[PDB]
């Protein structure tokens, strides 16, 4: 049961009388119970990487052998909780200890056993009914916004023998009991899952559905999909807060899991200060997003094992909520800092340094982590679909995408949103660069757009072409000036200016377009690209005539239409209905048509 | 408390470098403290670097020279290194290991604290908010420091970073629009510079607020290791218990990193990047992140690590990991130093990430952010024009270029250049900034809103 | 078709045996069942990294950039299980796919695979960005067995000359592109403009191809000649006159 400390050096401890110990199993070394992980075995010895400070650990100290590897404790109580990378509840530690520090070797249960939860069994279940892994045997009224579906652990099954009646219970109560091959398993409302073991699913379905954000540049030009894999440059003035806040508040994601994974102290305190105060509208009422968000937050002086395990704990919570048929946006704030924690652990283990110092397995670990995302046909009996969408940000030194973490991230992700401090300074909010950014999910979303927004795909292609054309013309204008351009190129420049200023740019702080419904986005782009087509037609069909039309004539005649296109931003879905917004954009199209027709 | 008699061993089994291996030890603690008497009666302290079975690898603070088997005695104190802390150690000088070197008495402890401390709970850490004025315009007006920020000074070898540090220690304080304190901790500081700090603070009378730790370059490197942890344990005591805003100035984290390298190699660990230990990130973070405001306690801890970048390579592990762990940078510039501008704080690459929280209405003044942005923009344009001036020649420049060059000259002469004993409140630094920005007419102050120009530009 | 799958989430050490399972099956089919087998080994980079992990755990001598010292031998044990045999009608054609890390052909994986294998078909980001498909960069591409797979009899007798001259003209076109960025268009001679036109039309017509388009070798060679006709005979210095006077005029 207990081993005994036999030696100590830094975090490494050597414990004797650990004959039955299992590799990578967790132990509580010392009288203070510093958590440690068995990294090597020999005879009856066990070598332990102790996550916490070993000062004071002495030979002969007990080493309690916890029968599990590093595992997240899943159940009611996650929503709104703030966890360390080792699942320690930071808010509960602070409340219970009345101390500004994490006590050394603290051992607070991750999910409170004190608090009672309202539990309603799956009405169909009976004594003797056949039940399997992933099956929902009850629902817990955890929050007004989230119903928590109590599921049998994967790798569990049998015939129900006792299922509790509806009522109030707690994480320590045996709520179900099942029997298989005479072996009887008694299940509470909590299941413990190794963080590095992929939670099973009946099938990992293709990711054919958008992950909305309400930011036009993100939704239209660079779409992500429920179950996607995305990257974000992390820098000072870039403004990753825009993406994080928009995903937390407006995304169609049912749940949000945010993983600090080794942040600066105050940079993490900012997140913990902001997220509780963010709010969302559900059923016409304003609710805090902490009713649907869970934070794995830890700073840079927290144990290195916590920083490395932060990503895995976050993705395992996200997988658990995916298994209930929810869509879970998991945002890792610095996979670069997770990778530095990985390199630090590798160096402490004295492993051979691979490319640029990072371990031999950084790429494999990033691949096996990002692979855990995706839309899935969930395990268990009630037919469900969930998803985990990983938005893992990465921090390239000074924009250098070459370092191993960034290179593997951009080779393993399928979207890259490429925020840009230069655009931030130019006041282009969001700061998405719309040249380095990309999204490889465009093909997968043809099936969806061709059904619900049939006209959006060519529209998007033309918008991207216009932006690329201005990117080309910017070089010419340097050499020979603006006036040298053909009228077609003037149309390109001015329509691109219109798009950049009044379509991609977006005043998120204001009520009218903080959230831009996709019908509004597609209508905006439809009107603008209709203007492009009409101006191009007018110039092209009259370049050969005596009455040659020019962008100057177009600007002077249709100043009203240009102003209305630029003002299209101001339509507010909360004051203008969807129908009214669509009707107004159709009216703008008709008026543009009339003006171009009268000119032509 | 330990009511238990201590055990003294003569069972020295080896002496290998700075390590005395003892055997037959009864239940050794890792990082226990040990007082060993040499054959001749000299006494040396030490720390149990490693433990295995009944063996104990006692790293002696002083050298092992003179230690022998069969006659050295070695008393195991039975506890890890705990530093005594009080308010009385505000206004004192201590060597790296807490022993007073100001010919005063040993600290009469209000409490005993483990120097390793515990990490501050992220859910209890509060965003830093207000400003800590340093008296140096090049940072108060352009890179100001928020209460709770960790903002290192990056300087090369031979630049006056120690002089800047002494000035900050003499002048720093709250903006005052008696609960302030400074913990100065020199690591690996040569005798001349240590004597300079000791004499400077005593003379210019800041000592009533300064707790000064000095680890001379010839003091043990293990004492260098425990110097910043004494400094920050005292800072935590004064800030989060005595409730006062503490500024911790850790001088020469490059020297601290060399001491860390020495101790790592003594453990016989294979080197990492550029020779430093692989865990230097976590160690530097354990030092730095003992900072920031906390929930419900008025006190706070602000840090100004000082780095001697070897070879001036910003990619060197020390400055690189410090940039990852801290929240800004204050560059000290060789070109300015040679030009004899003091303080030679190059404002262009220096950055303070939380300056936007440090400054503003009710903290420094309404116009601080605008003046800062405008001064930076004008300085950048001035450098650009000064480059263009050698290409096109002065007679070909426009009048705007002449205004920018005049601003550059007066900015480096009046705003940056300060003199070591000229203390400027942030209000005075801002008034100087406005005197400089009045070189231009309003229309070229394009980064200051009219709302602010109309109010502050005149006079 | 026979598929062996070892996904990113599957065990790392098992990627060491997956190629060997696939090639054992291919050898059963080719050298015992006399099938003509095409073997594809996807992400030999994710194989070499598994090999690196095992060698680092064993603490074996490293080669360059951490990989084991015997990676050449191991990748040879994999690749060399290809080719025909005497008296057996089967064959094994391998097309390993490996991701150059940081697009660097000198990285140990691509370097050793180039030493071991009989060529490399080079896929170029600088073409993928321009949206050319297939973005093959013939210039660093190579095929050691072309020298006998082409000629009179099999395929056509202008195949080698056309290939060599296309390579030469493409290289000179890249040189002209490189120099025009320095000197500009106004300082180029008409020969350099010929080379630039050849490069443009070569990437447009020869390389660029439909993902479902199957050009016979004869169509491809006719395109090659349509491109080489951009030049006068005297600038096609590789092709002998016996071939120029026969295929050039048409």
């Amino acid at each position: 049961t207990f081993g005994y400390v036999h030696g100590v050096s830094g975090p490494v401890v050597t414990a004797c009388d650990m004959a039955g110990a299992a590799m990578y199993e967790l132990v509580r070394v010392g009288h203070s119970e510093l958590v440690g992980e068995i990294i090597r075995l020999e005879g009856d010895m066990a070598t332990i990487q102790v996550y916490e400070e070993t000062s004071g650990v002495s030979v002969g100290d007990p080493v309690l052998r916890t029968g599990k590897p590093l595992s997240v404790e899943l159940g009611p109580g996650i929503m709104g909780a703030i966890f360390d990378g080792i699942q320690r509840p930071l808010s509960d530690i602070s409340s219970q200890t009345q101390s500004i520090y994490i006590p050394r070797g603290v051992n607070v249960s991750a999910l409170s056993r004190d608090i009672k939860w309202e539990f309603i069994p799956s009405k169909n279940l009976r004594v003797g009914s056949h039940i399997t892994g992933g099956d929902i045997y009850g629902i817990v009224n955890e929050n007004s916004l989230i119903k928590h579906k109590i599921m049998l652990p994967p790798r569990s099954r049998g015939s129900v023998t006792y299922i509790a009646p509806p009522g109030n219970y707690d994480a320590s109560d045996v709520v179900l009991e099942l029997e298989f091959e005479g072996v009887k398993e008694k299940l509470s409302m909590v299941q413990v899952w190794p963080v590095r073991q992929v939670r099973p699913v009946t099938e990992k379905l293709p990711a054919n559905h958008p992950l909305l954000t309400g930011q036009r540049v993100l939704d239209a030009l660079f779409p992500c999909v429920q179950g996607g894999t995305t990257a974000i440059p992390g820098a000072f003035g870039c403004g990753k807060t825009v993406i994080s806040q928009s995903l937390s508040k407006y995304s169609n994601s049912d749940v949000i899991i945010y993983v600090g994974c080794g942040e600066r102290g105050n940079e993490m305190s900012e997140v913990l200060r902001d997220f509780p105060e963010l709010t969302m509208e559900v059923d016409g009422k304003v609710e805090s997003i902490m009713k649907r968000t869970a934070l794995v937050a830890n700073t840079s002086n927290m144990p290195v094992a916590a920083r490395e395990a932060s990503i895995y704990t976050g993705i395992t919570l996200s997988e658990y909520f995916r298994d209930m048929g929810y869509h879970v946006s998991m945002m890792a704030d610095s996979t670069s800092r997770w990778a530095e924690a990985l390199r630090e652990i590798s160096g402490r283990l004295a492993e051979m340094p691979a490319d640029s110092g990072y371990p031999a397995y950084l790429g494999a670990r990033l691949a096996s982590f990002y692979e855990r995302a995706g839309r899935v046909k969930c395990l268990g009996n009630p037919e469900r679909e969930g998803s985990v969408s990983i938005v893992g940000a990465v921090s390239p030194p000074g924009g250098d995408f070459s370092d191993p973490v960034t290179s593997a991230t951009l080779g393993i992700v399928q979207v890259f949103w490429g925020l840009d401090k230069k655009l931030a300074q130019r006041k282009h909010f969001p700061s998405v660069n719309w040249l380095i950014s990309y999204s490889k999910y465009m093909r997968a979303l043809d099936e969806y757009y061709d059904k619900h927004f049939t006209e959006f795909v060519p529209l998007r292609t033309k918008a991207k072409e216009i932006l690329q054309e201005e990117e080309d013309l910017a070089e010419i204008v340097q050499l020979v000036g603006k006036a040298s351009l053909a009228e077609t190129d003037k149309i390109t420049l001015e329509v691109a200016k219109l798009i950049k200023d009044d379509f991609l740019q977006q005043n998120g702080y204001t009520p009218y377009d903080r959230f831009c419904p996709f019908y509004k986005t597609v209508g905006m782009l439809s009107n603008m690209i209709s203007f492009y087509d009409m101006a191009r037609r007018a110039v092209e069909t009259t370049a050969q005539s005596d009455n040659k039309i020019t962008w100057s004539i177009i600007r002077e005649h249709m100043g009203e239409i240009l102003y209305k296109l630029s003002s299209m931003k101001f339509k507010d879905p909360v004051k203008d209905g969807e129908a009214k917004i669509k009707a107004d954009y159709a009216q703008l199209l008709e008026d543009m048509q009339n003006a171009f027709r009268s000119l032509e | 408390y330990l009511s238990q008699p201590r055990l003294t061993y003569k069972t020295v089994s080896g002496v290998n470098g700075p390590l005395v291996i003892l055997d037959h030890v009864k239940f050794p603690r890792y990082a226990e403290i040990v007082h060993l008497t040499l054959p001749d009666g000299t006494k040396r302290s030490g720390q149990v670097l490693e433990v295995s079975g009944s063996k104990a690898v006692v790293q002696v603070f002083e050298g092992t020279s003179g230690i022998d088997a069969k006659k050295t005695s070695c008393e195991f104190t039975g506890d890890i290194l705990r530093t005594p802390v009080s308010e009385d150690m505000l206004g004192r000088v201590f060597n790296g290991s807490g022993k007073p070197i100001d010919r005063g008495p040993v600290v009469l402890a209000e409490d005993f604290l483990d120097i390793m401390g515990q990490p501050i709970n992220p859910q209890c850490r509060i965003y830093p908010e207000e400003m800590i004025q340093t008296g140096i315009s090049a940072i108060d007006g352009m890179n100001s420091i928020a209460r709770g920020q960790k903002i290192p000074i990056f300087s090369a070898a031979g630049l006056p970073h120690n002089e800047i540090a002494a000035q900050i220690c003499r002048q720093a304080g709250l903006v005052k629009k008696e609960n302030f304190a400074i913990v100065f901790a020199a690591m690996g500081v040569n005798m001349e510079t240590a004597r300079f700090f000791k004499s400077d603070f005593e003379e210019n009378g800041s000592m009533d607020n300064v707790c000064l730790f000095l680890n001379l370059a010839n003091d043990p490197t293990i004492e260098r290791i425990i110097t910043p942890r004494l400094a920050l344990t005292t800072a935590e005591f004064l800030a989060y218990q005595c409730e006062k805003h503490v500024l911790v100035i850790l001088t020469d984290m490059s020297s601290y990193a060399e001491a860390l390298r020495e101790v790592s190699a003594a453990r016989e660990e294979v080197p990492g990047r550029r020779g430093f230990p692989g865990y230097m990130y976590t160690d530097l973070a354990t030092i730095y992140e003992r900072a920031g405001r906390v929930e419900g306690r008025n006190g706070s801890i602000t840090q100004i690590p000082i780095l001697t970048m070897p070879n001036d390579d910003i990619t060197h592990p020390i400055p690189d990991l410090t940039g990852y762990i801290t929240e800004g940078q204050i560059y000290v510039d060789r070109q300015l130093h040679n030009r004899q501008i003091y303080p030679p704080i190059n404002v262009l690459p220096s950055l303070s990430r939380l300056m936007k929280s440090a400054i503003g209405e009710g903290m420094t003044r309404k116009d601080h952010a605008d003046v800062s942005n405008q001064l930076y923009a004008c300085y950048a344009i001035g450098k650009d024009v000064q480059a263009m001036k050698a290409v096109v020649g002065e007679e070909a420049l426009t009048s705007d270029d002449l205004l920018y060059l005049e601003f550059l000259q007066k900015f480096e002469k009046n705003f940056i250049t300060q003199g070591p004993y000229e203390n400027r409140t942030v209000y005075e630094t801002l008034d100087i900034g406005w005197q400089l920005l009045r070189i231009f007419p309003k229309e070229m102050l394009k980064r200051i809103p009219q709302s602010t120009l109309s109010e502050f530009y005149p006079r | 078709v026979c598929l062996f799958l070892n996904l990113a989430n599957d065990p790392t050490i098992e990627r060491i045996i997956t190629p060997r399972l696939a090639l054992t099956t291919a050898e059963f089919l080719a050298y015992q069942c006399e099938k003509h087998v095409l073997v594809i080994l996807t992400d030999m980079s994710s194989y070499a990294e598994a090999l690196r992990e095992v060698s680092a755990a064993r603490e074996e001598v490293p080669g360059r950039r951490g990989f084991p010292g015997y990676m050449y031998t191991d990748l040879a044990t994999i690749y060399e299980r290809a080719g025909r045999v005497e008296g057996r009608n089967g064959s094994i054609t391998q097309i390993p796919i490996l991701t150059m890390p940081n697009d660097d052909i000198t990285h140990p994986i691509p370097d050793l695979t180039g030493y071991i294998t009989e060529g490399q078909i080079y896929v170029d980001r600088q073409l993928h960005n321009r949206q050319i498909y297939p973005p093959i960069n013939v210039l660093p591409s190579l095929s050691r067995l072309m020298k006998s797979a082409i000629g009179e009899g099999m395929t056509r007798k202008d195949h080698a000359d056309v290939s060599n001259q296309l390579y030469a003209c493409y290289a000179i076109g890249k040189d002209v592109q490189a120099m025009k960025a320095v000197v500009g268009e106004e300082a180029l001679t008409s020969d350099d403009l010929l080379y630039l036109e050849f490069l443009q039309k070569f990437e447009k017509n020869f390389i660029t191809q439909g993902p479902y388009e199957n050009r016979t070798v004869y169509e491809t060679l006719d395109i090659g000649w349509q491109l080489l006709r951009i030049f006068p005979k005297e600038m096609l210095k590789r092709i002998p006159q016996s071939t120029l006077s026969e295929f050039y005029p048409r």
């Binding site: 051979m352 | 080197p271 | 603490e59 490293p62």
Partner: peptide
């Protein structure tokens, strides 16, 4: 690093052989 790792391995082996 590899040389020093090998050397430490061999020192460990010698220490074991000393017993």
């Amino acid at each position: 690093f590899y040389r020093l790792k090998k050397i430490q391995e061999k020192k460990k082996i010698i220490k074991e052989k000393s017993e």
